């Protein structure tokens, strides 16, 4: 036992070749990444984040619900017909159902759970006060304006009379008051919450154009134009390959790098990104396996800076190494539908950003990827608009291909009201098996595994995980979830 260094464990197998087959596709129209543009992109995300918390606070008196902005960017990107890889640009509808739903949940007050009797009375009073107030200062039909304006008295009077109530009595009347006020308050605040969702979208649209105009200025500065080289393709079915970019990449600015106790630090204009040593070596292997426009690999370091800076602006967990080995050995899995250069196990996968990740093996976004054959694993981020689109996307692929096709989907049952995404997959005619990993009895890998130490790598899953095998007939013939194969798969979790 003599590790190369302290964090020299390996969480990937970049030797597995793909079995994903696509029709050969032309290059993506996304512009190649440049540190100057990523630097502007990062400071525009921060401003957009600050705009968002300013709007929630001075138009609803609340802070933004945790991670709602991140969840907003995923939802917008499912429907975004725009061009920016990170920011929404051209969406319908303008108002995001995701952001609207989450802001509405914390109205008129973000509900915290209760730890005392006086604390329950505390929260109950605050809700009744904020519910009555919102109706008074914002327009409402004098019915529902007073359907609640009384229900707030009735709980107010009950608080003054019944000095014998308990902690349960208060929490019960919160929900009771919540049901009477919910429809009434939501209808009243519908205009303001939509205004927040719409303003954030339009500010994003404005930042997109600022990013593109700075980008096109750099391209014209380096004598590069936005044209189509040769879309004349011999139509054919090929094994998959990383997503390519149409416009040629310019020369990259100089970038400084130094390692400090097995942590690689990369700086551009004083802006530093970090990545642990073994993961820095992994990006090297991915870059060598995937990049074809960088002879002598002279743009590796600046493209690593853009990659780490990109995922820094952005912000699930990965499956254990021994679970991926079983999926590949038992079901031929060679490809991840939702991953990143930093957490991917195979050297072929789908990720959000084709401009920064394609150089490192990404096939681009999963929805823009139409495989005709292959055995896939899917661990999507929690976003019901993305998960719903994913199920429709997979089913279209399984419908329209005679080649063996298989999708093994991992969905944490975080909600006791199950998302229709999971419900749709349960009723899918391609479902060959459904498996439940018990809560507190299976592990995940940390989402920040690219800088976190070995001791912080693995955590036990606190919820159940549903594992569904979506396979067409040839895919089921080749990678069937037999009893003996399901035996060895669960053994990889114990």
Residue 482 and residue 360 in one domain? yes
CA atoms within 13 A on the CB side of 20: 28
Cβ–Cβ < 8 Å for 105, 65: yes
Collapse the DSSP code of 35 into the 3-class scheme (helix H, G, I; strand E, B; otherwise coil) and give the result. helix
| Nearest to 367, CA basis, from 334, 346, 392, 336 | 392
**Domains contained in the chain, number:** 3
CATH assignment of the domain containing 481: 3.40.50
What dihedral angle (degrees, nearest 10) is formed by the CA atoms of 419, 423, 424, 426?
Answer: 150
Helix axis angle, 68-79 to 384-399, nearest 10°: 30
Class of residue 484 by CB neighbours under 10 A (exposed 0-12, middle 13-18, buried 19+): exposed
| Spatial separation of the C-alpha atoms in residues 254 and 432, rounded to whole Å | 52
Backbone angles phi, psi at 453, to 5 degrees: -70, 175
Token representation of residue 148: 């609640």
Residue 295 lies inside a defined structural domain of this protein:
no
Lookup result for tokens 């530093």: 272
Residues 182 and 200 in one domain: no
- What backbone phi and psi angles, to 5 degrees, belong to 290? -120, -35
Q: Are strands 431-437 and 465-471 parallel, antiparallel or unpaired?
A: antiparallel
Residue 59 lies in a domain: yes
Q: Would you state the structure tokens that stand for residue 469, as one six-digit string?
A: 């095998």
Select from 438, 422, 415, 420 the least CA-distant residue to 470: 422
55 is a domain residue: yes
| C-alpha to C-alpha distance for 52 and 363, rounded to whole angstroms | 31
Strand pairing report for 431-437 and 271-276: unpaired
Q: Are 328 and 348 in contact (CB under 8 A)?
A: no
- On the 0-12 / 13-18 / 19+ scale of CB atoms within 10 A, 396 is exposed
Token pair recorded at residue 459: 């955590």
* Number of neighbours of residue 143 by Cβ within 10 angstroms: 9
Distance CA 42, CA 127 (A): 37
Residues 94 and 142 in one domain: no
Ramachandran sector of residue 269 (left: φ over 0; alpha: ψ -120 to 50; beta: rest): left
The resolution in Å comes to 2.7
φ and ψ of 275, to 5 deg: -160, 135
The CATH number of whichever domain residue 146 belongs to comes to 1.20.1270
* CA 199 – CA 205 distance, rounded (Å): 10
Cβ atoms 394, 444 nearer than 8 A: no
Q: What is the 3-state secondary structure (H, E, C) of 342-408?
A: CCCCCCCECCCCHHHHHHHCECCCCCCCCCCEEEEEECCCCCHHHHHHHHHHHHHHHHCCCCCEEEE
Task: Specify whether 471 is located in the same domain as 325.
Answer: yes
C-alpha separations of 449 from 23, 71, 340, 363, 459 in Å:
34, 21, 11, 21, 11
- Are 47 and 149 found together in one domain? no
Nearest CA among 288, 261, 295 for reference residue 276: 261
Q: Answer yes or no: is 168 within a domain.
A: yes
| Number of C-beta neighbours around residue 37 at 10 A | 21
- For residue 201, give both structure tokens: 């979208």
Instruction: Classify residue 27: in a domain, yes or no.
Output: no
Q: Is residue 184 located within the same domain as residue 195?
A: no
Specify whether the CB–CB gap between 137 and 191 falls below 8 A. no
- State which approach was used to obtain the coordinates: X-ray
How many CB atoms within 10 Å of residue 256? 13
Q: Which of 101, 98, 94 is nearest to 198 (CA)?
A: 94
Pairing of strands 256-259, 237-239: unpaired
Do residues 352 and 427 share a domain? yes
Shared-domain flag, residues 148 and 89: no
Given 188, 204, 229, which residue is the final one in a domain? 188
Within 138-239, residue ranges assigned H as helices are 144-161, 167-188, 190-221
Q: Return the H-helix or E-strand segment holding 135.
A: helix 117-137
Domain boundary among the residues 154, 188, 222 is at 188
Q: Pick the last residue of a domain from 158, 178, 213.
A: 213
Binding positions for substrate are 71, 101, 384, 414-418
Sheet hosting strand 335-336, strand order edge to edge: 335-336, 374-378, 405-412, 465-471, 431-437
Task: Look at residue 287 and tell me if it is in a domain.
Answer: no
One domain, residues 205 and 348? no
Residue 372 counted as domain residue: yes
Q: Which residues are annotated as a binding site for S-adenosyl-L-methionine?
A: 379-382, 440-442
C-alpha 392/C-alpha 387 separation (Å) is: 9
Hunting for tokens 């991953």 — which residue is that? 339
Task: Kindly state whether residues 397 and 435 are assigned to the same domain.
Answer: yes
Alpha-carbon distances of 375 from 354, 379, 448, rounded to whole Å: 22, 14, 26
Find the distance separating the first CA and the last CA of the chain, reported in whole Å: 24
Q: Could you tell me the residue range of the domain that residue 127 belongs to?
A: 117-188
* Whether 342 and 438 share a structural domain: yes
Whether 81 and 175 share a structural domain: no
Query: Which residues, 6+ apart, have CB-to-CB distance to 174 below 8 Å?
Result: 111, 120, 123, 124, 127
How many residues make up the chain in this entry? 494
- Bridge-based pairing of strands 374-378 and 335-336 is parallel
Q: Pick from 173, 183, 209: which is nearest to 88 by CA? A: 209
Q: Which residues contact 447 (CB under 8 A, 6 or more apart)?
A: 316, 317, 318, 343
In degrees, rounded to 5, the angle at the alpha carbon of residue 421 between the alpha carbons of residues 437 and 370 is 100
Establish if 418 belongs to a structural domain: yes
CB 20 within 8 A of CB 373: yes
Is the link from the previous residue into 108 a cis peptide, with omega within 30 of 0?
yes
Report whether 327 contacts 479 (CB < 8 A). no
- Asked if omega into 106 is within 30° of 0 (cis), the reply is no
């Amino acid at each position: 036992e003599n590790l190369y260094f302290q964090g020299s464990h390996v969480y990937w197998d970049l030797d597995i070749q793909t079995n994903a087959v696509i029709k050969h596709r032309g290059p993506s129209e996304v512009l190649p990444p440049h540190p100057e543009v990523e630097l502007l992109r990062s400071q525009l995300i921060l401003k957009l984040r600050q705009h968002y918390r300013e709007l929630c606070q001075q138009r609803e008196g609340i802070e933004p619900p945790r991670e709602s902005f991140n969840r907003w960017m995923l939802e917008r990107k499912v429907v975004d017909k725009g061009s920016d890889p990170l920011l929404p640009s051209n969406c319908e509808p303008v108002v995001s159902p995701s952001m609207f739903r989450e802001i509405m949940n914390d109205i008129p007050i973000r509900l915290s759970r209760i730890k005392f009797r006086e604390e329950a009375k505390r929260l109950l009073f605050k809700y009744a006060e904020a519910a009555r107030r919102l109706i008074e200062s914002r327009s409402a039909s004098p019915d529902s304006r007073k359907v609640v304006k009384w229900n707030v008295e009735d709980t107010f009077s009950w608080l003054r009379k019944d000095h014998s109530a308990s902690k349960e009595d208060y929490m019960d009347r919160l929900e009771h008051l919540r049901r009477q006020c919910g429809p009434h308050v939501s209808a009243a605040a519908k205009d303001s919450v939509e205004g927040i969702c719409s303003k954030i979208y339009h500010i994003s649209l404005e930042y997109v154009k600022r990013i593109r105009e700075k980008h096109l200025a750099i391209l014209k500065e380096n004598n590069i134009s936005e044209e189509v080289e040769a879309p004349e393709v011999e139509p054919r079915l090929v094994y998959c390959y990383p997503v390519r970019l149409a416009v040629s990449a310019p020369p990259m600015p100089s970038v400084e790098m130094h390692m400090e106790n097995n942590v690689v630090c990369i700086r551009y204009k004083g802006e530093m990104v970090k990545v642990s040593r073994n993961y820095f070596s992994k990006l090297w292997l991915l870059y060598r396996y995937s990049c074809i426009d960088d002879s002598a690999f002279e743009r590796f370091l600046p493209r690593v800076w853009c990659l780490l800076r990109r995922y820094q602006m952005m912000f699930q967990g990965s499956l254990p190494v021994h679970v991926f080995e079983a999926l590949h050995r038992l079901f031929g899995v060679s490809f991840e539908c939702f991953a990143s250069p930093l957490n991917c196990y195979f050297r072929q996968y789908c990720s959000a950003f084709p401009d920064t990740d394609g150089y490192f093996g990404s096939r681009g976004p999963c929805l823009d990827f139409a495989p005709l054959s292959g055995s896939f694993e899917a661990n999507p981020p929690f976003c019901e608009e993305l998960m719903d689109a994913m199920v429709s996307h997979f089913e279209r692929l399984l419908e329209s291909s005679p080649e063996p096709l298989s999708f093994i989907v991992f969905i944490p049952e975080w909600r006791e009201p199950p998302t229709p995404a999971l419900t749709r997959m349960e009723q899918s005619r391609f479902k060959r098996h459904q498996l439940i990993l018990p809560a507190f009895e299976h592990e995940y890998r940390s989402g920040s595994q690219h800088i976190c130490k070995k001791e912080e790598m693995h955590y036990k899953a606190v919820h159940n995980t549903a594992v569904l095998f979506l396979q067409n007939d040839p895919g089921f013939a080749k990678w069937a979830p037999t009893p003996e194969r399901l035996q060895e798969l669960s053994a990889a979790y114990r």
